[PDB]
Amino acid sequence: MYLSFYITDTKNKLIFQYLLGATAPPQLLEDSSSDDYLDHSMVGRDLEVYKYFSVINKLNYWCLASTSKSKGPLDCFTFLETIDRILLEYFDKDKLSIKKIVNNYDRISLIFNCCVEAGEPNVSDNELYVDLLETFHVVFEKKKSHLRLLTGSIHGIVDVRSYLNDNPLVAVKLNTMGNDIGIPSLHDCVEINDGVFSPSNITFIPPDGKFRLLEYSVDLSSQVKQSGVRMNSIGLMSLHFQNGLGKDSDEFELSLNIENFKKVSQVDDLKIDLQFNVENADPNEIAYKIKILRNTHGRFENSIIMGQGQWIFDKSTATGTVPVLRGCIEYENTGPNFTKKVDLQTVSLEYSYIGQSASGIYVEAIDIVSGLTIGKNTKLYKGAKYKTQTGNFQVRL
Amino acid sequence: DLNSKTNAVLKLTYLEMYGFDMAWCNFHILEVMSSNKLQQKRVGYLAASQSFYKDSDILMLATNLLKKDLKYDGNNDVVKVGIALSGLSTIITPSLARDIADDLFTMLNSTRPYIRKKAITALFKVFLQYPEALRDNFDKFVSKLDDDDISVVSAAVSVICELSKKNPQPFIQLSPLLYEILVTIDNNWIIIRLLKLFTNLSQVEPKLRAKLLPKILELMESTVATSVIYESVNCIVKGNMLEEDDFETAMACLERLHTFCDSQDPNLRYISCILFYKIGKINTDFISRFDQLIIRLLSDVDVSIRSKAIELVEGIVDEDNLKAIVQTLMKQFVDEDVVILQTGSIVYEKSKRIPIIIPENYKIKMVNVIISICSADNYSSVNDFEWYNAVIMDLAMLCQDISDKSLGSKIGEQFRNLMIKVPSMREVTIANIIKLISNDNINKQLPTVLRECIWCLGEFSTLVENGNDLIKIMTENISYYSHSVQEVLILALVKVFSNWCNNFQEDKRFEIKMVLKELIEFFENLSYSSTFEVQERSVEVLEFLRLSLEALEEDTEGLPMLLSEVLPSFFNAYEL
Amino acid sequence: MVDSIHRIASALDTAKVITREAAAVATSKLGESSYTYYSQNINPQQLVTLLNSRNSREVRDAMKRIISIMASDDDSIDVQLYFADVVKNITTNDTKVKRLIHLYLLRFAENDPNLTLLSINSLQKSLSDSNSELRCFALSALSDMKMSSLAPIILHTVKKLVTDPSAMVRGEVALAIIKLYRAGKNDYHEELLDILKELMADTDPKVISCAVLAYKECYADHLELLHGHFRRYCRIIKQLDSWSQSYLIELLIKYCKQYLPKPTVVDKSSEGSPRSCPLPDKYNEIEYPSYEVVNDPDLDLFLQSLNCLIYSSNPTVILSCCNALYQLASPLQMKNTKFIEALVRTVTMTENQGNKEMLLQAIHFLSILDQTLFLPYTKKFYVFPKDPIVASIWKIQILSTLINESNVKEIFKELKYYVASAHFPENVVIMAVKSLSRCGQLSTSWESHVMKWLIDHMESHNLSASVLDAYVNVIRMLVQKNPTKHLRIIFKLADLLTVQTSLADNARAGIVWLFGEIASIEFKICPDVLRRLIQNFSNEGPETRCQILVLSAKLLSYDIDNFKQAQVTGSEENNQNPPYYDFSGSRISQMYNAVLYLAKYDDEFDIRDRARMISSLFDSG
Amino acid sequence: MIHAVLIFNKKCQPRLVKFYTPVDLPKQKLLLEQVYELISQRNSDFQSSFLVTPPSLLLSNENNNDEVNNEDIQIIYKNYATLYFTFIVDDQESELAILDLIQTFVESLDRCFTEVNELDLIFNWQTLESVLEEIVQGGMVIETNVNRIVASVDELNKAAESTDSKIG
C-alpha cells in the first residue's frame, strides 16, 4: 500500500511531499486558517484508492498524507502529527513558517520514511532556568453574584533552558495548592517516571535544546471545584456590569485582582478581548465606545467596529498588584434598533503568565540529582520561557 | 519645467491606472493641461479623463481648458482636438456637456478624419448623458456620416449604435443612413460593426431587420475577413431574425460556416462548430448537412472541439452513425483519453505517439452520451448489443479512475436499461457485473454501480447459474457498502433466495442452505447500520432465511411449500 | 478540484524546493534544484547520477531524493535501480548512509528476493559485527523485509543482539524478532520469546518504542509470550515521555486483539484483579487465567496506563489512549469508565482547539462503544461556545451518548442553551437533535425534560429543514424506548407536521415513519396521519416517496393481522372481532391504494416494488 | 468594444494593456494571468493563438486546453516571435473586429518595430500604445490601413522627440 505525505503552508502552497512505498500515482485548504482543516481527496478510481488524506497545521505549516485504502484516516494523521512535531524540534522552533519548512524539506522526508518501512508505520509516535509560563483561559458563568468557573483552561508550558553537558536529573516538585494537580504533560526530554514520581512530581533529563518541560492543562472546572477556588484574582475576574447607564453608557468594573497570582510570576501580556455580544445585536447596533479603563500597566485600545475591547496588560504587572480595569462602555448607535441592552456576553480574558503554574503546578522545589553540589558545574539559567495558549477565557454573563 | 511635467504626469497616470484615487490627481493634471504643449495636453487630458468622473471643479477646470484648446484649431490640430475631445467626452457634466456639444459640433467640421472620428466618438459619450445636446447635434452627425473617409463612417455608426442602446427611437430614425453607409464600405471591421449595430437596433424594430437583412448577406458575400461571416450568422441567429421563415438567410450563413470549419484556425473552427450546434438545436436539417464536419472534428485533438462534437453527436445519430460513433469513441478513448485523468499534461501534436487527449470532464460527458445514444430511437439497433454491454462495462472501469461519481451513476442506469432489453446479454452482463463487484476497485467509489448490479441480479437471478457467487458476493461485500447500496443489496438478496428455493433444482444444492445461514448473520449484522430503515430490512430478511433453512433441511422438494407457508408468515409477522 | 490543488502544491514545492536544491548543491553537484524539477517532472536518472557522484554531501542528497520520490509517488520510479546502488552504499561505514540505506531497503524489500537477500546478507554480517549502531539499523531493515527465508538468519542474529548489552541494539533487536515472526514462525518462536523479554527491559525511548513497536507485531500470533514481556512495556509507559506513551498505546491495541489469552477459567483473584490475569503457562507460574487481557500486569497495565497517560494531562496520549481503548475492549474493558473519564478530563482540559475536536471525536467513538461511562464527564463537554460547527456538532453527539440519570438534567439544560444561543448552523442543530434522542434512550427519569426541550426547539426556534430531519429521527428514537412519554410526543409531532407541509424530504421521511412506528401502541389513530401524508407524496423526491410508502405499508401491517382477520372481509372472522380489528381494508386501503399508485409512478423501482408487494400482501389478507 | 488589450513579452511580462472601459482591475488581471498561463501550456505550434472559453474553462484544468473564459469574455491570443498579444473582448464586439484589430496591430508593430525586443517595446511603449488607441477610437479603427498605421507611429515619434527628456 502506499502512503504519501505532503506538507503545505497556510496559504496552501505545497512545501513537501513524500511517497512511500509502493504504487503510487480548495475550501479545506482555505479554511486552514483554521488551524486544523485540509482533509481527504479521494484520488480514487475503483482501484480504490483512497485516498486520504490528512493534514496537519502547526505554526503556519500544514502537512498532508495520503494512504491508499484501508489504514484508516487515523493511522495517516498520527503519522503526520509525529512528523510535524519532529519538524518543530528540529528546526528549533519557534516557527515553522513556509520559509523554514521549505528549508528543511529533506530532513522532513527522511523523518518520514523512518516512520514508515517498518513496516509498519512505525509508529507514529551549564545553566538551568525554569521559566513557568502559563496561559490561562477561563469560561466563567455568572450565576447568583458568584462567577462560577464553568471551564477553564490553563495551559501551562514549563520550559527549562539548559546548558548542561551530561545528564544530570531534575526533580521538580509541584505544589498543590491542594487542587490535585493532575496532569503535567512532559516534553520528549522529560521523564515522569511512575507514580516514583507521583503524580505531582517530574523529572527531566538533558537534551541539549530548550525544552517545554511540562505542559499542564488544568481544566479549572474540576480544580477550582476540588480546590474551591472562586478565582479570586485571576480568572474570576468579577466583572460587574453596572447599569446606571444612560442611553450610550454603561460602567463595568472589572477587577483582576492578583491576589492569587502573588508567585505567579510575571504575566507577559493579558489580552482582554471583551466581546460584546454582537452576535445577537448586529455589530452596528453595537456601536460601542470604551472610554476610560484603568489599568496601572498596560494599554486600552478599542476595536469598536468590530465590536471588540482589547486591553493589553504589559508583563510588568506582576504581584499582588491588582490591575483594576474599570471604565466605561459607551454604546454608540447609529441605529435606534439597538435596544440599550447588549446582553453582556463573554468577556474573554486570556492571561499569559509567566512563571507560574497553569494548574497551580508551582514548582516548590527543583532539585538536581546527581551527587552534584552547587557549583559543581551546574548553573541556574535565566530565560527558559514557557508559553501556553489556549482559548480564551469566557465569562458569560 | 515641461519635460519634468511630462514626467510627473506619467507617475500620476500609472497610479490612476491602478485602481487608486483619481480625484487627488486632478489638480496636478490641470496645471499640466494649462501648458501650451500639445503633448502635455494629451497626457493631462488622459489623466483627467480617467478621473473626472464626478469631481466638478476638476471637470470645470478641464473644460474651460479643453475649450480654449478646441476652439482654436490648433494646428496639430488633430492631435489637440482629437485628445481634447476624448477627454471632454469622457467627461460628462451638464454644464460641460453643454459646452462640449457646442465644441464637438465645431470639430466635426475639421478636415482630417482623425479629428472627425474623435469628434464622433465624443458626441457619443456626451449623449450618453444629456439629451438636449443630442438633439441639437443629431443633425451634424447626419451630416458627418456622409464624409468620404471610412473610418469616420465607421465611428458615426458606432455612436448611433450607442445612442440606440439608450434611445432607440431617434435612431431608429437614422437607420436609413446607416443602411446607406454599410452599402458603401469596403472594410471588414466596419462592415462587422454596422452589422452589429443593426442587430442592436433590431432588438428594437423588426422593420429594420428586414431592410438590413438583405444588407447583410450581400456583405458577407463580399468580404472575406473571416468575422464578418461569423457576425452575419450571429445576427441571423439573434434578431431571432430567424423565426424559421428566414432559414434561407440562415442557410447561406451556415454554408459560409461550413466552409470556414475547414480552415486551420481553431478559433474559427470552434466558433463554427458552436454556431452549427446552435443552429441545429434550431434546425435539424442543417445538421444533417453538417455531420461530415462534425466527424472530421472528432479526429481533431482540440478539447474544445471534441466536446462540441460529442454534443452535436448527441442530436444526430442515425444507426449506422451510432454504431460508428460509439466505436469510434470507445476507441478513441482507449486511445484519446488518458492525459488528464492522469493529471493534466498539456497537448502535443508532435510526439508522433501522441500524448493523448481528454480531461476528466470530457470523459464524463462521453460516457453520458454513449448511454443516451444507446437509449434513443431506442438502439433496439445497436445491432450488436454486445459491444454496448462491453462498452458500458469498460467505461465503468475507466471511470473508476475518474471519479466523479456522476459518471459512475449514469453508467449504471443505462446498463440497467440495456439489460432489461435484450434478454440475451443478460447473463453476460450479470457475470461481468459480479466480477466488477468482486474487484475491489468498484467497491471503492462505487456504490451506485453496486446498486444497479444488485438490482439486475435480483431480476435476473433466474437466468443466472451461480446464483451463489452472487450471493456470496454480496454477502461479504456487504460491510463495505454505502447505506443505499446495503439496502439494495439486502433486498436483492432476499429476492434471490426466494426465487432460488422455488427454482433450486439445480440440486437443491446444499449451498442454498449455507448461503441462507450466512445471509442471516450478515443481515443481523446490518441491523446495526446507522439508518434504522436499512436495519429492519436486514432483520426481516434474517428470519426468512432462517426459515428456509429449516425447510431445506428436511427436503428439497418440500421447500417451496414450506416456504410458502412460513416465510410469508414471518415477514408478515415482524412487520405486522 | 482536489487533484488540481495537489498539482498546485507540487508546483509550489518545486518553486521553493528547486531554489533550495540549487543552494544546497553549490555542494551536491549539485542536486539542490532537482526536486523542484522532478516535483514538476523529476526523474530516476538525476537520482542515480547523484549517487554516482563522489561527494558525501551528494551521496547523502541523492539518498534523500531517492527516498522522497520513491515516496512521493513519482511512481514511475523503478525501484530496483535504486536498490543495488544503495546496498552497495550500506557497506560504507558511515552511519548516516547506513541509515538512509535501511530506510530505502525496507522501501524495496517491500517486494523482491534477490534485493532482499542481498540486503539481508549485508545485514546479517553487520549483525554479527560488534557495532551496535549498525547492527540495530540493519536488524531493523531485516525486519521490514517480509520473508520467511530470512528467518533463521534474522533469529540467530536477533538472539545475539538481545544478548548484547546495548540499548540501541535492544531497540532494534525487538523490531526484528517482531518483523521476523510476522513470517517464519515456528522455528523461531521459542527463542524469539525468551529474548523479547530481556530486551523490553531497556531504558532508552528509542529502544522501548522499538521493542514495542515490535511486540506489536510478532504477537499478533504468539501471544502467550508477549505477556511477560508486555509488562515492562506497560510500566515503562506509565513512567515516560508523552510521546513514547502514544506509541505504547497503539501496540497495546493490537496485542489485545490477539491474546485474549483464552478465557478458560478467568481468575479474577490474581492481582489487583480485573478479571484476572494469567501468567503464561510456559512460564507456569501458577497459571493465572487467561483472560489476562483484561487483568494481568500486561493488559491491565495497559488499560490503567492508558488511563493515567490520559489522566496525565497530555491531549495526545489522551486521544491515542482512547483509540486503543476502543479496540481492546471486550466491551467490559470500556465500560471502563476510567478510560472515558480520562478522555473527558482531557477534552475539557483541552484549551487548544485542534484538540477540542479530537476529544470530541474520541468521546463520541467511546460513547459509541460505551455510553454509561462518559457520564461523570458530560458537564465537562458542555459545549465550549467559542467553537465551530463541527465542534458543536460533536458535543451534541456526546451529550447524546452520556446521559445517565444524574447527568441528564444538566446536559439537557446545556443543549437547550446552545441551541438557543449559538448562532447555530443548521448542521449543528441537526446533530444536536440526533443526540437528545440518543439520550432518552437511556434515561427515563429525564426523558421528559428532553422531549419537552426538543419540541419546544423545533416548534420555537425557527428551525432549518435538515435540522427538522434530525429532530424527527430523534423524537422517533425516544418514542422507541420511552413509550409513556411517547404518546405525548407523537401528539406534538403530528401537530408539527401537519403544519409544515413544506417539509423537507428528509423531515417527511422521519415524521411519516415515527407515526408508522408508534402505531402499535395506538394504531387506532394512525389512519389519520397517513392521510396527511399521502396527500403529499406526489409532490416529493424519490427517497421520501420510498419512505412514505414503507410507512403506509407498515402502518398497514401492524394492523393487518389487526386489519386482516378484520378485512379478510366479511370473512367471518372479522365481523368477529378481537380489539383492533380495526376498520380495515377500507381505511388502510384508501391509504395504500394512494401510495401504491403513487409509487408505480415514481421512477425508483424500489419504491414501486415495495408498493407492489405491499398491495399484494395487504390485499390478499 | 474592446474592452482591453494586453501585450506580453516572452517572459510573460505584460508590457501594455489597454482598457477601454472600466472593468474591475482585479478581474482584469486574473484574466490576463490565466491567459498568460494558458499560453505557456500551449505548445509553440498552438501557440494558441486563442483562448475562448466556456466560463467553466475558466480555468478548469482538466484537459489542459481548458481554455479560458469568463463567460461573456473571449480571449484572442497572438504569438509573434517574442511577443504575445492578447485581446479580451466583450461579447458584443464581433471576434472578427477583434482579430483584425489585432492582426493589424501586430503587423503594425512588426512593421514599426521590426525587431522588437522587449526593450524596444518598452522604450517605445508610448508609441505602441498610441498605435493601439488610434486604432480603436470613436470605437473605431479609423485607419485600418497597415500603411498609415506605420506612418502614424512616426508622427507620434516626432512629437516625443521634441520633449525627450520628459520622454525618453
Author numbering:
A (entry chain M): 1 to 25, 39 to 138, 212 to 483
B (entry chain A): 63 to 638
C (entry chain B): 1 to 621
D (entry chain S): 1 to 168
The authors write:
The structures reveal that AP-3 adopts an open conformation in solution, comparable to the membrane-bound conformations of AP-1 or AP-2.
Similarly, the distance between the N-Apl5 and C-Apm3 subunits increases from ∼2.2 nm to ∼3.9 nm, demonstrating the variability of the “open” AP-3 complex in solution. The large α-solenoid domains of Apl5 and Apl6 contain several hinge regions that allow an accordion-like expansion and partial rotation of the domains. The general organization of both the compact and stretched conformation of the yeast AP-3 complex is similar to that of mammalian AP-1 and AP-2.
